[PDB]
Amino acid sequence: APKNRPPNTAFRQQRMRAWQCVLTPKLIVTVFSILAAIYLGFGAWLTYLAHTVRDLKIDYTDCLTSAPKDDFETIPQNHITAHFSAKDSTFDPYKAQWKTTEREVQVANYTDNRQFCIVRFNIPEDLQPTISFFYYLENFYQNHRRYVNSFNAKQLLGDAVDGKTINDSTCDPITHDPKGTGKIVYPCGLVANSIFNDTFSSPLALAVRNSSDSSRPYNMTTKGIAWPGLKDLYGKTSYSLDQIVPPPNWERRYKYGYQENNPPPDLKTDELFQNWMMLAAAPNFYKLYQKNDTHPMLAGQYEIEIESNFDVTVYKGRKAFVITTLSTMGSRNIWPGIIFLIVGGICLVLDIYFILSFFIWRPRKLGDPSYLSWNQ
Amino acid sequence: APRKLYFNLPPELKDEEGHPIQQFPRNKIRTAKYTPLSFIPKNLWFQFHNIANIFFLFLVILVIFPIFGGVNPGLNSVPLIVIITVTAIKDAIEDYRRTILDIELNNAPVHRLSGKARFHKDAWKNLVVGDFVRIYNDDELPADIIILATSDPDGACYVETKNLDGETNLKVRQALRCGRTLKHARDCERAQFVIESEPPQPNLYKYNGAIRWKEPREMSEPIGIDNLLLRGCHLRNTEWALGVVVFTGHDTKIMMNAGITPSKRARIARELNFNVICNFGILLIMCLIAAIANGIAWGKTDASLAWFEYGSIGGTPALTGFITFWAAVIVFQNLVPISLYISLEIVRTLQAFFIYSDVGMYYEKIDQPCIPKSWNISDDVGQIEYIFSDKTGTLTQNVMEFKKATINGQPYGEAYTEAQAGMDRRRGINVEEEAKVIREEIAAAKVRAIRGLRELHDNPYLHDEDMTFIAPDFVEDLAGKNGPEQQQATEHFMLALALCHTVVAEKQPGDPPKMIFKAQSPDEAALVATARDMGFTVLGMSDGGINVNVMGKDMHFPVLSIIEFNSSRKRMSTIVRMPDGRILLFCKGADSVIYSRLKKGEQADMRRETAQHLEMFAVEGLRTLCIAERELSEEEYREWRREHDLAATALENREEKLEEVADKIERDLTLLGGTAIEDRLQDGVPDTIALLADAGIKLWVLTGDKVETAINIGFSCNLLNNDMDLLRLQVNESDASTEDDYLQLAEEQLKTNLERFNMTGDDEELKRARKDHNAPSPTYALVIDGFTLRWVLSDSLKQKFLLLCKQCKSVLCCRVSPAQKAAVVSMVKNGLDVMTLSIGDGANDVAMIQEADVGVGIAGEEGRQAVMSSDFAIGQFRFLQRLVLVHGRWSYRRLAETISNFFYKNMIWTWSIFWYQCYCNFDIAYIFEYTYILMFNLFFTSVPVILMGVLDQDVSDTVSLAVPQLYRRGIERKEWTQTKFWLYMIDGVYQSVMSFFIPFIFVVLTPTAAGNGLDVSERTRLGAYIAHPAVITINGYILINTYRWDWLMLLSIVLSDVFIFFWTGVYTATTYSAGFYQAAPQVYQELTFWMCLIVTPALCLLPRLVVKCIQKQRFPYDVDIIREQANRGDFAAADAAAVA
């Protein structure tokens, strides 16, 4: 009896069930037809979507640079980017006045003096809820190799890790006390150091002469502004408030240190900190600041008070704010629609050319022993 | 190193610690590539022949410096150690299979003795030089042994040399004169004598030595080959041959023509090595771009990096650019892919497995499939031409039948050949049914001839289906029909075929006793075996001469004398006194040797008809023989015998005097008839050769056998033909010719032959012959023996010789030496830029096999001296078509497509990373969450491409045998060019551009595209956004490029994509990651995610889909059209016929 007989399976003998993917022009015409159909459909859909949302972006670096001090001068047109369908209403965007003012404010004890800008921007139509409010930072690179690994995780989680492990961690230059003493910084990275410092004071809707009272504060919240998982990442600190200090740049805010009146901010609630410490990808990123889910902003000449605390033209950067309204797709991005339409259009024109060159023009009947290249 | 041997006191001139000089190798034989004690360094140096491993080892020792990105212990050092270890494990397992069959051979038993006082059974390895040895019938010989005695007196043993030299006949060997008398097994311990020998020489038929047999004082008996039993020779017609082992180990001429299984490499590895170097070049170029741009951007006091990041990785922009350079070299490591070599090892091993488990190449009589022995080279078999072939072992089974005869001008063949069947069915005539009806006529004639024989005297020794000379006309002519004189003619002829022989007859009792015929060559064995199947069966020489049982009645012949066969005589004779009183001399031999010894001026029509019939028979591939007779006289016989025994008594120059006296009696003769014996080919060998020659392969039969048998086999196999000029390059080793005249004669022959081919070997008509792949002029053959071959392979004639051998359609070397086999293979292999297969069955064949690119052994049961050193081990020649035509073009196309798609894959990955670096001031920041990069090339994408390489097939297992011309595309090496590589890399770069800049656009050119509105523009969420569509794109491109979408391939594609989704969704549900804490619920549930997931794979696979469909329609392939044909039908006949 023969024992070395190789098993006559249908896999060992390479006989598995299969489909010989011959590209006869009854198979590729249908492929290109279905691709063109699906992609032109999705392109029309996404174009309608990216046209159903509407927004307004205003840049405000010349506030500290060149805004006037007592009169509401107009903003040049290279700052207003307003996508609003219902054009030529009683209000029209691209006409916003703006004025800066050095103001003596209080924080905990010492009443420091910051510098403010005030922007009167008019939206011409209502925008239904979930009106978000992002800030925009050009030429800011959060995506560097040393920058993106520079923080302690357990510390943000809420912990008193050590004075040694924090001292030699990947957050090298900013992990110990800048002054003489040997305290340890609470957020020990330079990713938490450079957090955006401007402060947006919610749109005070000027009197539209319907409710003629001067103030109509469209109260937008800054809570529930990040993913709940982030809240599961952070936590109030276990440090004794004795050995922690703002790293170098919260000084103009914690001008005396972490104390019983200026306490170390709990991170599970500080949601703007949670938005910042998730590192953006490009240098021209947006980030979420406020929102409102339960009431529609009406057409009106709103006014926002932007404490311009972040000196950004120092590195030729730019900063701005946007008030986009959302849809199921996202915010206004005209490019998905155009990309889908372009792919569908080229698939359609190649379908047309293939059906032509394989049905109407010469069809090159299948398998003839004339092209075999050993019959010539 | 000329050695000496002593048998019972050593020579005091080699004292203690001075006697071990003349260190003789151990009788073991190592064909394994690695020893246990030295496997590691050898295998490491072999794996590092791949240049990329140098780059990977340098990059591993470079991450130890704790300044760049990835820490050293696991991430970057586990892959190298694991890859090296699994590669070494595969190679060690393969080498151990070779080693286990090696150690199976090394334990073969031999009766050893010089210390044992008896010839106890031992193994081959236990054979020290100078130890007595006994050998029995058909025993493979352990080592080169000098004879000392044998079973029969006079010292005659027979050696079947077919394993070393392709000669079939049992060559006679003589025991040395003094010392033959040691019949016992223990009377050797008083045999005191000394042996003198010479250094080991690889020339087979040149050896000399001496013996000192110590009242005897001093003896001396030179020992040529006639005392030398070689190692592959099989001892026959002798019960015991009490020899002495003189050579052992690698001193033997059988082993002295090989290395130690020189490790072959797959010829795709080298072009792949150049491609690796080019990819490393582009890697360095892009890393230098990165370093310069990073330094330029980091040496500014105006960028936002100076303010917010207090930093520099060195107190200079130049130093930080340098650090970034090396760190980028770490990040862009996959330009020279690490996963290339392990993927290719895994693919090649699986293809070797699939070769091993194919029943379509399972030979039953030996019970083993096409077991591969080098799993690296499975793709080279898709490129080879120049299938060099042995003759005696591979092509011919070496069973010799008796087909036809021509007696009294009358032919009796009634035979048909598969050779002729193919030769006719190739043209329009006799296509299919004629074969069946003709074989039916042959069966009918066979049964009618057996019936006619039964009507004659009862023949118990005759056995149906034990006879090949079927001729009913012969039976009726011997019965008496058609003539009373023709009966006498055929009767006397069949009596002559039972008189001229020397065969020994033995009766096998039981069922009607079939008699066995032990002869000196299977030629006369077939002669006599047919001379009993038509009456006139033979018995033993019962103290007189032969006894013939003619038509049921016995006849005792006294044999007067016999003149034995020789290589120079070409004929053999015997004088016998027949019962009719008169004595008669028979002389049978070659056709052209008897036509010279014939009484002239007689039987003009008879002799011319016999000449034309032998011409027909020798053209049909049969090995003809002529028999002649002469009525000798009593006084003439006794006087010739007195001259004969007088010449025998003259001890000096005796053989020449015997040949001179024996040529005075064989001059006047007359032609009884002419036989036609056929040396049987294997099954399907003519069809195999036809199929291969249609593919594009050129087949050079180069045997070690005589010059005319080679031409016979060239006629059988249909290599030769009847419309073919013959080029016989010969420099007759004219006695004592000046050597330079040898070369001058050879040069003139080469020059006139090249002339007539209308050219010469001017070295300009070689660079135009390094780029030509065309079946040559089909009307030329080149027959050249070893001597002419030896002299045309020396300095410059070689080149000329090459050109000659390139024009002639066929080549038939003859009496060629193992070293010369290897030299011809190496001349065609190096002188041209071409691949080369060598199929063999023996020692000469092992030399030919290790020197060729692909070595195939045949398991011809002759001792696997050429199977333990081959790439593959086939059982028959007919499976070579299956192997080369199915598992060759398949494997080659598969490896080409695998490595092309693989370069594409790694290109798209690393160039997407590079574009991201472009968007972050070239400071090398991963966008892929430090685990996508870890698991990408491992899990998400490796299985689709390895499956495309292992289990993809273009046409079929049978449509490839039905259309061999497709193999031409592998001959000219058109599936792995250097434009498929560059086109695939350009494709990868384009697809990286698209598959990075589409999701980047989607989720970065807008404020937080996330539907409910939250941060998904993060550095890692964008990583998922471009890393899921990238995996789907790569697997689609690996799928679009395959031809046979089957169960496993589509299953693996689906599981790889579903596995990236599952791995994300599972790994981002815990706090352990903290960058991906919940990435699944807030990336999946978006709509831009699915929009990009469906748009980037199409936008990446659309250009090659368009190119593929158009380049199928407007321009075809050959495989394209054969698949468009075999799709509908046109090959269902072969499929249905083969499956059942």
Ligand SMILES: *[C@@H]1O[C@H](CO)[C@@H](O[C@@H]2O[C@H](CO)[C@@H](O[C@@H]3O[C@H](CO)[C@@H](O)[C@H](O[C@H]4O[C@H](CO)[C@@H](O)[C@H](O)[C@@H]4O)[C@@H]3O)[C@H](O)[C@H]2NC(C)=O)[C@H](O)[C@H]1NC(C)=O
């Ligand atoms: C909001 O954030 C921005 C950016 O983080 C922040 O602007 C920063 O203020 C810090 C100081 O609080 C600046 O750092 C200084 O830079 C100057 C110039 O290089 C240095 O001379 C300063 O060193 C002196 O002062 C230190 C502090 O007393 C001493 O320790 C030191 O010995 C020196 O005497 C100091 O390093 C930083 O440059 C700016 N950033 C930019 C971009 O200009 C802003 O103040 C923040 N506002 C609030 C309210 O948090």
Ligand SMILES: *[C@@H]1O[C@H](CO)[C@@H](O[C@@H]2O[C@H](CO)[C@@H](O[C@@H]3O[C@H](CO)[C@@H](O)[C@H](O)[C@@H]3O)[C@H](O)[C@H]2NC(C)=O)[C@H](O)[C@H]1NC(C)=O
């Ligand atoms: C983390 O690394 C820093 C840098 O090496 C370590 O530095 C220094 O730590 C000592 C020990 O507390 C500090 O000294 C205290 O300094 C005051 C001077 O104001 C001195 O009067 C006290 O007697 C005491 O020595 C020192 O100021 C501090 N210097 C700096 C620049 O940080 C630090 O100790 C490391 N952390 C730990 C936990 O070890």
Ligand SMILES: *[C@@H]1O[C@H](CO)[C@@H](O[C@@H]2O[C@H](CO)[C@@H](O)[C@H](O)[C@H]2NC(C)=O)[C@H](O)[C@H]1NC(C)=O
């Ligand atoms: C969105 O803004 C509107 C602005 O009116 C908020 O409505 C006011 O909410 C406050 C409490 O936060 C009430 O005291 C006022 O009486 C409300 N005014 C009106 C006219 O309704 C609304 O609460 C905000 N909602 C969200 C989700 O932020």
Ligand SMILES: *[C@@H]1O[C@H](CO)[C@@H](O)[C@H](O)[C@H]1NC(C)=O
């Ligand atoms: C605020 O409190 C801190 C400590 O409690 C004190 O040192 C500081 O002087 C206070 N502010 C003012 C303006 O005095």
Ligand SMILES: *[C@@H]1O[C@H](CO)[C@@H](O)[C@H](O)[C@H]1NC(C)=O
């Ligand atoms: C918005 O509502 C909060 C909660 O009552 C309140 O503290 C805040 O002053 C309001 N905003 C304005 C501009 O009044």
Ligand code: BEF
């Ligand atoms: F012994 Be062979 F036919 F080279």
Ligand SMILES: [Mg+2]
């Ligand atoms: Mg052989």
